[PDB]
Every structure is written in C-alpha cells, then in structure tokens.
Amino acid sequence: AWFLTWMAKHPQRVSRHLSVRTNYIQHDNGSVSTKFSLVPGPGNHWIRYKGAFILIKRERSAKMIDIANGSPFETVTLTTLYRDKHLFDDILNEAKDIALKTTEGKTVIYTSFGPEWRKFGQPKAKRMLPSVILDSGIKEGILDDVYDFMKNGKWYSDRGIPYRRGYLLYGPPGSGKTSFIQALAGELDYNICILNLSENNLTDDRLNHLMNNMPERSILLLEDIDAAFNKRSQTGEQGF
Amino acid sequence: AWFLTWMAKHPQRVSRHLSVRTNYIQHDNGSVSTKFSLVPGPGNHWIRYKGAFILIKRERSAKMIDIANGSPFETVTLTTLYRDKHLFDDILNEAKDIALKTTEGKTVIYTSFGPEWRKFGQPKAKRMLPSVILDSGIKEGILDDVYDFMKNGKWYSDRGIPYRRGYLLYGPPGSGKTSFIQALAGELDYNICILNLSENNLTDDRLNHLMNNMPERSILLLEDIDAAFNKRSQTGEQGFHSSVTFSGLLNALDGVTSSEETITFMTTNHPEKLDAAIMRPGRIDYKVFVGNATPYQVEKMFMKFYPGETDICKKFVNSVKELDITVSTAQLQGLFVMNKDAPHDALKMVSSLRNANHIF
Amino acid sequence: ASRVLYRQMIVDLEIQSKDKSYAWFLTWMAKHPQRVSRHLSVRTNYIQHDNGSVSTKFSLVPGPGNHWIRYKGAFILIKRERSAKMIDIANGSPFETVTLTTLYRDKHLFDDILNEAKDIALKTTEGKTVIYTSFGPEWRKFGQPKAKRMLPSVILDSGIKEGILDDVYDFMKNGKWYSDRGIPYRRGYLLYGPPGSGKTSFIQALAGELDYNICILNLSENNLTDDRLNHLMNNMPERSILLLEDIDAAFNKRSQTGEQGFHSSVTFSGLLNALDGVTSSEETITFMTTNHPEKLDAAIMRPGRIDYKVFVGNATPYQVEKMFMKFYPGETDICKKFVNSVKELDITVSTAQLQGLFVMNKDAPHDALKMVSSLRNANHIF
Amino acid sequence: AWFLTWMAKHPQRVSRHLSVRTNYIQHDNGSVSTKFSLVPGPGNHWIRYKGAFILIKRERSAKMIDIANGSPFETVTLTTLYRDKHLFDDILNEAKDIALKTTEGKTVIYTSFGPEWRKF
Amino acid sequence: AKVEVNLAAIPLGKNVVVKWQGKPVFIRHRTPHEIQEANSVDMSALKDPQTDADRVKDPQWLIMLGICTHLGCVPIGEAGDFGGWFCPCHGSHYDISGRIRKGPAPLNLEIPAYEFDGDKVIVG
Ligand code: FES
C-alpha cells in the first residue's frame, strides 16, 4: 500500500480512474477526525519515471475476500521494458521512505510488573546527548568506554568471556544522573529498563528473573542500589 | 454511506431505481422508533452538480458477502469528463459535513479504576469559562500562563526539561475550584482525569502508574493533595490506610514521569499542612490563592444570574455591604437558583445570609 | 432502447431481506385484498413452553415469483427473488429481495405503503414503563416492563399533587435557564410522612405520566458503598427518574455502622459528592423519600442537594371520599354515610389501610361500611 | 519458499516476471526494519543449472485460499528431461543450505519454576 | 484478541479457566458471604491495598488473569488458608478477591479489560 500512497504523491501520471480511502477516528469526546485521499483504484494507469514509461494495472479479485482486512484481494502489476535499469528497486525504495518518514521512532521506558517487563507510558521523545551537561572528562569518559565495549564483542566472544559490562555513577546529591543515562540510551538507540532496589516487596529470585529476560536491545538501570546493602535481614529478621 | 445519504438529499437528480433503509431501535420502555429513507439503490443515476453532469452507477457483487456488515459488497462508481475540476472532492466533502452536522464536542471526565482509567458517565456538555466567577486577575492569569506553556513547547524540548507544568489552586473550600478546572479544560478542549487522594485507597506505585498512563489530550486534576501530607503524620498512628506516600508522589511527579505536554492542576484547603519541599519548578510552578467571595465576584455573579438588572445589583451590593459578612461562593449561589427569575426576592431575603448554610 | 425507455418511465424499488421493512411488507401484502398472487410460502412461528406445551401459528406469504396488486387505484408489480448463492449468516437463511415496479407518472405512492407497514409496529408501543435496579455498578431491569398506572389512581392530599406536578414541570421546561447560568441541571424533591402513605405509588404514577423509567435504590441495602453509589447515580439510563428510599439510613447512624463494619456503609459524604460534585448534569430528576424525617440534617435542604419538601400525612376526608368513589364509582350517599362514620371514628388511618379495607373482599360499598367501626383496630384482624 | 529464495540469488536465470516479498518488523520503540525481495512471482521462467535448462512455472490458484497463510493457494513447478538426470534433489539440497546457514546452534539454558522447566 | 464467555452457565461459587491471548482467566460467581467477608478485611494487612469495588466493578462476578505475579506460574483456586487462590510454586496465598495476603508475591492479580453482556461477558 505504500506504493499506492507514493503513486498518489508522484506527479506526471495518467490516472483516469480513482478510489477513495477514508480514515475515520471516533474520539471519546464525540468529535471525529476524517481525512480523504484519492488513490488510483482499479483500471490501468501510466507513469513516466526518470524517462522510463511504467504501466500500472490495479486488479480487484472477482472471487476472493481477505480475512486480514475483510476486503477483496487486489494486485498491483507494474510493467516496463527490460532495457531499463529495473527502476522498480528505486521506486520501491523512495516509496518506502515515505512510510518511514512518518514515524522515526523514540525511546521507550520499561518498568517492572511482577516478573514481567512492560512499557511505562508512551514512547518518550529522544533526549539529545548535548542537552545534558556534566563535569569535563565525564560524559565523554563514559561515552568512549561504552563505544569500546560495543565494538569489543569479538574480543569477548572468541575468548569465552561473559559479554557484560557494569557501570556505577555515585553522585551523592543527585545531578542529572538519570537524565544522563536516558540521554545516552537514546543516543545509542536502546530502550531503558528501570528498576529501583528501594521498591518494597522485591525478592532476590524475582530480581534475578527480571535482570535477565529483558526486552531486546535494552539498557538496564538500577537506581539507589545501596538499599540492598543497608536493608539487611535485621529489618525483616522475622522472615519478611 | 455518507455519499449515499448525501445524494438522497440532492434535489437536481433523476433516479429510476431506489431502495429502502430502515432505522429500527426498540426503546426499553416498550416504545419503538422507525424511520425510512429511500436511497438510490442498485442501478444507474444522473446528477448535475453546479454545472457538471455526473453519472452514478451502483452495483452489488453477486459472489461476495461482507463478514462485518453481513451483507454483499457494493460499490458506487462516479464518472464525468476529465476537464472538470475533479469535482468529486467537492461532492464528497459535501457528503462529509452533512453526515457530521452533529458537532458533538463534549468534555469527558475519566476516573481511576485500579491501575487504569475509565470513562465516568456520559460525556458532559461543554461549560464555557465565563460560567464560573473568580477574583480579578486570577482567572486570566491562569489562562495566559497555560497558553504560554503550551505554545512555548519547543523551548522545553530543546533545552533539556521534561516539559511538565503544575498549577496549585489553594484556598478555603466552597470556592468552585473544581468547577473552574472543568471550565478551563472544556475551554482548552481537554478531557479531565479526576483523582482524589482524599478517602481513596491509593498505593504510590499505582498512583504513579495512573498519572503516567493517562489518556492523551487530558488534564490531570489531583484533588486535596494535603491529605497525603496529613497522613504522613496521621495514618502512622491512626490507620486510615488510604494514605499513599509523599516520596512516591515526588517520584510520581518528577522521577520518570510523562512528558507529553502534561499539565497538572492540584487543589487543597489546608496549605499550612503543605511543606515547602514539593513546591519547586517542575512541580507546582504557578500557585494562586482563592479566598472567599469578594465584591467583584458577587457583582459579576449577580449579573450572570440577572443580566441587565444593574440597579437591582446596586441595591444588592448595598445590602451585602450593610451585612458586612464573609461568605464563600457556593452559599451565595443558592440565593439566585431558588429565585430563578425573582431577584427582588433575593434582595428581600438578604438578612437570611447569616443562616444561608441551613435552608438557603 | 425499449428497455431503456421502459425503465425511464417507471420507478423500480428493491427491499433487501435485512431490513425489517421486508418482513413488514410481506405481512402487509399478505393482508391486502386487491391482490393477484399465484405463489405462496408458509411461515410458522413456534414457542415450546417449559412444560412441553407448544403454541403454533402459520401464515401464507406471497413467496418467490411475480405478483400483481393495485394500491389506491395504481398498479404495482411485486417480484420476490430468492438468492441462489448467498446465505444470510445473521438470519441463517438465503438472501431475499422483494422489488416493486411502478410507472412514475404518478408519485411513487410508496411512503404510503411503508406507513401502512409502520401501523403494524405502532401497536407495540403499549408498554410504557420499566423499573431499573442496582444489580451491580449499573442499572438493569428488575423484571418485565410494568404497565403504567394513571396518576388520578393515586390520591394524596389536596394540592400536594398539583404542587408537585407544577414544580416538576417548571423545572423541566426551563432547562435553558440552567444551561445559561452554568448551574448543574438537576433538582431534588423530598417526600416525608408516615409509612404506607402511597409515596412510592405516587412516584411510580408520576414516572408513568412523564414516560421516564424508574431507578430504585434502597439505602438500607447492606452492601452499598459511597463510591459505587456515586457511580450508579451518574451512570443512570436516559429518560429515567432516580428514586431514593430510606435516606434516614444515613441520618440516624451516619458513619457509625461504617466504623463498626456492620451492614451498609453509605453516609453523608456519599450524598454530597454524588449530588453535586463530578455528577451527571446533562439531565436528571431525583426523588427522595424518608419515613423518619425527624432525623433530618440541616445541611441538606439547600439548593443543589434538595429544594422541595412536603409532608404526606394521614388521608384527609377528601382523600377518603375520592378513593371510596374510586373503588365504588357512583354509589352516591354511601360515601356520605361512610365519611361521617369515619369522622365519628376519629383516628389516624393511612391510605394503605383504606385501600386494604376497600379491596379485601371486592366489597359492595355498604359492605365496607358495615364493618367500618372496626377501623380502630382493623390492622389486627383484617 | 526456500526454493524461490534460492532462485532469486541464482544468476544463470531468465525471469521476465517478478513479485515483491516484504519482511517487515515493527519495533516497540517505533523504529521499523523493512526489506524487499524480488522473487520470480507468477509466469514462466528459465534457469540453467549444470548445463541443463529447467523450465519453471508459478501459479496462483484461484478458487482457493490457504487459511493458515491467508493467501491464494500458490504452486510452483519445474520441468526438464527425464532422459538426463533430474537434478531436483540437488536443487532442493542447494536451497536447503540457504536456510541452514542461518542457525549457528545456540545454547539454551532452562530453569525450574514450579514442577516444570522453561526457557531462561 | 477478544474472548466471549457465557455467564449463565457458571453456577454460584464455581471457578472457571479461560484463555485470553493464551493468558489464563478466572471467572468466579461470588456468594454474598464472600462479599461481606472480603469487604470486612483491614487494608493494613494487605501488601497491595485495594478494595473490592476497585478490584472489580461487579461484586457478583470476579475477574483476573491467573499469574502468580512472583513468577510466571499460575495459582489454583479453592486452595490456601484464606479460601481464595493458592500458588503451588512458592506458596503465595491469595484471598477470595485475588489479593496477595501472605507469601513472596508482590502484587495482587491484575485484571484485564472486560465488558458485561448480560447472559455473557466479553473479556479483552
Ligand atoms: S511464583 Fe507462585 S508463589 Fe512464587
């Protein structure tokens, strides 16, 4: 369908036939948002792409119905001369980006729910790394190190090392540590997995389950780990 | 459907073929609703639309059945010469508006159910800003504040701040703070997500989850925040077990919270019980006091209830000056509703304002 | 060319099987006298009762094939087509279409036919009231749709009826006033009196008058909660009247039972919040009744919570004679001897007692008179 | 489908027809990973393999639907001389390797919660 | 995605297991004694305080997904000292309202989105 949307955008056609595609969203407040696009629809159209003439033949199935959308099956059949560059790759690529451009993607924050990891709010917009500042030698001092670890996978894997790395940021007062972590994760394009050891009702086995089994390409962040040290069994000597 | 309904209402057309569409809703009480509409149905039709002849051909497949609609598939084929404006856009847009003539903008009010929000009652009709009376400056001050905040969005994003706002409306009760919040949300076209910390069993984790998974395009209104602070010292020995945690509230306010232009309005009646620690930029940014009814408020509300009766309001304000008493907004409202179109009587029973809390 | 011009002069209309108009028109045409139909199809309706008894009825409808009818002196061509490929999965039957054809020189003369079809449906609007109950967080029918009862049937003290009717009409007519003020559009009426004063009957009669359904809630119910209370009175069905009964359950004990954890938990805070704050305001009329007004709380008779209160005491002699002639239409001067008999009796009597003693045997009026001396203690025996 | 995938990469091919096969994965973060593959699609094709020309045909069976896949029932076929070696076994073996290369033999560790093991 | 369940088929006090998305679902038609007892508890004991009206809209019918909330294993109804649900994996106890009352479980059983259809109930 990206091809249809792209073809709507591309000028220099002969599109004698047309079809309407409607998007109708019913907001809970009563109002509704509607948008209206005229796509080529059935019939045969023509294109002049980069000096190459491409015929487009929409077809609507005379028997089938697609359960995936509850609509008759359709096919889009391009046609041209072999002598061309096979620009189909080019047109498909420059139609794909239109779909891609609509949603670039953002950073997602996960949080614990029992043993499971699940999202916590809508995807937060990417925080650019320069937007957070620290003492000189610090931000780059972490950035270069993590980049080195990212590329040293061979240095670990071919020699049987656990391909893990752990960092500690122990700023006493609290100055943008979490902000820096989130900025770095967005910069690396990694979702953030938050966990606070100060959380009540957190067990060792459930923790070990959660620190593993993470969502793919995610960075784990353990806040205020000192709770594990300080909150010894004395607070729960009865067995809490 | 929109286009068929539209063309059924087009005067300049010829349609040999027709078909019936019936609306049938059986009321619970035993009454019933019936309504016919002879749509063009299958065949061919001609329509002339502002100078352009268009042939309309409707057909239904003899082999498809739509699972959703439970009916055979149908299509409507328009056709006309190329040299037109592609007037199909005009016709079809016309069909759009006529279907959506309702213009049903409302103001939903959500409410917490466990860790998720739930629509509470039918979408209430919009209530405009002037319907509620507040002291001079306070209202418009809040309006311009919030407008500046929403408009100045890219500022927050670029300069590394999570783009959250917090407004505190504190003062003695019976001032219609909640009503004003509702009016403001309706004005801004935003739903309301009430969440009363008072007399509500909230666990700080659940509180954070609710405030951060709020539906989009919705203003968060926390009611009586002071309850949490009160239970910081009370429930530890009382056992109200509906207390949440102040530290959780701070984390639920700033820690990893939402950033989608989230705007939060908080109210209280006991500011003394609040501490100057929750008050910081990014959590309670612009606070205002809302005291008892002032002269400005009484004049404005009397004109709201009795437009054009300025002299009557003059007698009334003389009377209340003579009384020289402190009254909240809600009590003074009762005078005029029980005298819907009888301001002279409200003038007569001015002496009863001392006992307004009992019968009036 | 011939077919083209033919279709140019004549209207042809189709009715899919999905529309109720399909069956309605089939039924109508089955009844039409001026008909020439040489095709038929049976339709049999079955309902097997719980005990095995079965009710049967059949009817012949035109069925597939062409027909010929004349309606208002105009000829019409029916043509019922049976689909040979489709199965209407909703109805579990093949698709059908009944199409009509007519010259267009006259009007289609067709909205008339479907209005005749409407007349069959119009007979079903006789049921005119339903009782709604708090089955849970929402309202559901308590039973079969009750039959409306006429307002003069219930006979309260003179003026009370008229005052209540006038006041509620006044509230309802001027909704635009409430909209303009921005004040919530809801009003409250409190009925207080001794038990058996026909208060609930009066409310039901009024609901019948204005066609609204009744929403019953008893605050002596032991499993009510103020949160669910606030939910119910704001999730109420449309075209409804909310009737609250034994509101004194909150007056007498308030939160004492709630702290004790014994029976119902609803208290004043539930009343206040569910009356004004965050409440439904599009439209609502609320009725409260209380058998023990003596425990009233001075914070409630204020606008926004309630505005109308009226005592409903023992039936007056006016009520006595009115209901006597209700049970015994006509029967003049028997009512006279009865009214002075009860005046000599000179005791407090609820309208329920009078109803009971006028109905216990379906008495002749003199028969009711003969034993009327025992009303001093008739609550014991009769 | 392995056969079509193999044929797409086979250079000694004459294919006037093509069809688009798209692998699309939507990540939870809103980022999208997409690929396209120009498989031969319907119509006749010719391929030379070990000096033998093997005609090929692809056909979308109307009046059918594969309910599990939810597409019209497709069918592919090859043709060549019975007299000379029918190399279909060899062709399939070649195509199979294109799938087998993907897996390096991951080790999987299970762990016990309740009276049953599960992946960890 | 959506699972439709006939409520009338369930007698009073009888639990059910239903697979929504593959996740288990418990349907229990509570008795008034259960309602009174559950509403009579003290929130202080609960590790995850919550009230019956806020756990589920209808006191008649009680819904949740059958997962321990400690690990992925499923509990079993009509078991445990508290007469509700019990988990045979690490001994987490759940009261009649599916509220963790004792054990390593951190949270009460979560509730999915559901809608009442009179005779039937639509869960999803
Ligand atoms: S997983 Fe069930 S008790 Fe721990």
3-state secondary structure string, B79-148?
ECCCCCCCCHHHHHHHHHHHHCCCCCCEECEEEEECCEEEECCCCEECCCHHHCCCCCCHHHHHHHHHHH
**Residue E106 at interface with chain B, using a CB cutoff of 8 Å:** no
For ligand 1, atom 3, the nearest C-alpha belongs to: E90
Q: Which H/E stretch holds residue E18?
A: strand E17-20
Distance of CA D119 to the CA centre of its chain: 29
C284 φ, ψ (degrees, to nearest 5): -170, 135
Nearest-neighbour CA in chain A from D64: distance (Å): 8
Residue C207 CB partners (closer than 8 Å, separation 6+): C129, C213, C214, C241
- Whole-angstrom CA distances from E57 to B182, C138, C227, C284 are 26, 9, 11, 23
CA of E22 to the centre of ligand 1 (A): 19
Mutation target vs C (from E116, E117, E121; most C CBs, 10 A cutoff): E116
Q: Which atom of ligand 1 is nearest to the CA of E72?
A: 1
What the block records as the tokens of B175 is 């001032």
Please, are residues C52 and C68 in contact by the beta-carbon 8 Å criterion?
Answer: no
What the block records as the tokens of B172 is 């003695």
Query: What gap in Å lies between CA B222 and CA B242, rounded to an integer?
Result: 15
Q: DSSP letter string over C73-103?
A: TEEEEEEEEEEEEEEETTTTEEEEEEEEEEE
Does any ligand 1 atom lie closer than 6 A to the CB of residue E90? yes
Q: Any idea of the CA torsion for B320, B325, B326, B330, to the nearest 10 degrees? A: -50
What the block records as the tokens of A121 is 């709010």
Query: Which residue in E44, E111, E113 is closest to B239 by CB distance?
Result: E44
DSSP state, residue A71: B
What the block records as the tokens of B339 is 């005298």
Nearest Cα to Cα of residue C284 among C167, C185, C371, C203: C185
Distance of CA B82 to the CA centre of its chain: 47
Give the orientation angle of helix A177-188 with respect to helix A139-151, to 10 degrees: 40
Q: How many CB atoms lie within 10 A of CB B282?
A: 14
Q: Which amino acid is at B95?
A: A
In terms of Cβ atoms closer than 10 Å to its own Cβ (0-12, 13-18, 19+), residue E67 is: buried
Looking up tokens 């009862």, which residue turns up?
C149
Degrees, nearest 5: CA angle C279-C283-C286 = 75
- Whole-angstrom CA distances from D68 to A67, A68, D39, D65, E19 are 11, 11, 21, 9, 21
What's the per-residue H, E or C state across C223-240?
Answer: CCCHHHHHHHCCCCCCCE
D112 contacts in chain E (CB < 8 Å): none
Please, are residues B136 and B147 in contact by the beta-carbon 8 Å criterion?
Answer: no
Query: What gap in Å lies between CA B140 and CA B123, rounded to an integer?
Result: 26
CB contact under 8 A, E106 and A202: yes
The dihedral built from the CA positions of residue B266, B270, B275 and B280, taken in this order, carries a sign that is positive
Exposure string (b/e) for A92-114, b if CB count within 10 Å is 16 or more?
beebbeeeeeeeebbbbbbbbbb
Breakpoints of chain C, after residues (C–N > 2.5 Å): none
Q: CA gyration radius for chain E?
A: 14
- Whole-angstrom CA distances from B247 to B203, B205, B251, C108 are 12, 11, 6, 76
**Residue C260 at interface with chain E, using a CB cutoff of 8 Å:** no
Conformational region of residue B30, where left means phi above 0, alpha means psi within -120 to 50, and beta covers everything else = left
Looking up tokens 């704001």, which residue turns up?
C234
Residue C352 CB partners (closer than 8 Å, separation 6+): C196, C197, C198
Nearest Cα to Cα of residue E109 among B115, A210, B202, B242: B115
Q: Which H/E stretch holds residue C22?
A: helix C20-31
Nearest Cα to Cα of residue C233 among C132, C82, C150, C84: C132
Closest A-chain CA to E108 = A114
- Whole-angstrom CA distances from B29 to A114, C28, C134, C165, E69 are 48, 26, 17, 22, 46
Please, are residues D75 and D58 in contact by the beta-carbon 8 Å criterion?
Answer: yes
Catalytic-residue membership of E29? no
Does any ligand 1 atom lie closer than 6 A to the CB of residue E92? yes
**Residue E73 at interface with chain A, using a CB cutoff of 8 Å:** no
CB contact under 8 A, A131 and B64: no
Of the residues E65, E67, E74, E89, which should be mutated to test ligand 1's pocket, given the most ligand atoms within 8 Å of the CB?
A: E89
B201 contacts in chain E (CB < 8 Å): 43, 49-51, 54
CB contact under 8 A, B241 and E57: no
Mutation target vs D (from E70, E76, E87, E89; most D CBs, 10 A cutoff): E89
Please, are residues B242 and B200 in contact by the beta-carbon 8 Å criterion?
Answer: yes
Nearest-neighbour CA in chain E from B261: distance (Å): 27
Residue C41 CB partners (closer than 8 Å, separation 6+): C60, C61, C62, C63, C64
**Secondary-structure breakdown of chain D: helix, strand, coil percentages, each rounded to the nearest 5:** 20, 45, 35
Q: How was this structure determined?
A: cryo-EM
Exposure string (b/e) for B326-341, b if CB count within 10 Å is 16 or more?
ebbbbbbbbbbbbbbe
What the block records as the tokens of B235 is 């429930």
Query: What gap in Å lies between CA A139 and CA A176, rounded to an integer?
Result: 12
Of the residues E65, E86, E87, E100, which should be mutated to test ligand 1's pocket, given the most ligand atoms within 8 Å of the CB?
A: E87
C307 contacts in chain B (CB < 8 Å): 338
Catalytic residue among E29, E33, E90, E93: E90
CA of D109 to the centre of ligand 1 (A): 21
User: First CA to last CA across chain D, in angstroms?
Assistant: 32
- Whole-angstrom CA distances from A18 to A38, A49, B327, C288 are 6, 20, 68, 63
Resolution (angstroms) equals 3.5
What the block records as the tokens of A202 is 């957190």
Query: What gap in Å lies between CA D44 and CA D15, rounded to an integer?
Result: 7
**Residue D113 at interface with chain E, using a CB cutoff of 8 Å:** yes
Please, are residues C330 and C358 in contact by the beta-carbon 8 Å criterion?
Answer: no
Q: DSSP letter string over B264-307?
A: EEEEES-GGGS-TTT-BTTBS-EEEE--S--HHHHHHHHHHHST
CA of E75 to the centre of ligand 1 (A): 8
Query: What gap in Å lies between CA D26 and CA D34, rounded to an integer?
Result: 8
Query: What is the strand order of the sheet B43-49 is part of?
Result: B13-14, B43-49, B52-60, B74-79
Exposure string (b/e) for D39-76, b if CB count within 10 Å is 16 or more?
bbbbeebebebeeeebebebebeeeebeeeeeebebee
Residue C187 CB partners (closer than 8 Å, separation 6+): C168, C171, C284, C285, C286, C307, C308
Our answer on whether E and A touch (3+ beta-carbon pairs < 8 Å) is yes
Does any ligand 1 atom lie closer than 6 A to the CB of residue E68? yes
Helical residues (DSSP H) of D1-120, grouped into ranges? 2-9, 88-100
- Secondary structure E strands in C179-303: 186-192, 213-218, 240-245, 284-290
In terms of Cβ atoms closer than 10 Å to its own Cβ (0-12, 13-18, 19+), residue E7 is: middle
HSE at residue B106, side-chain half, CA atoms within 13 A, is 20
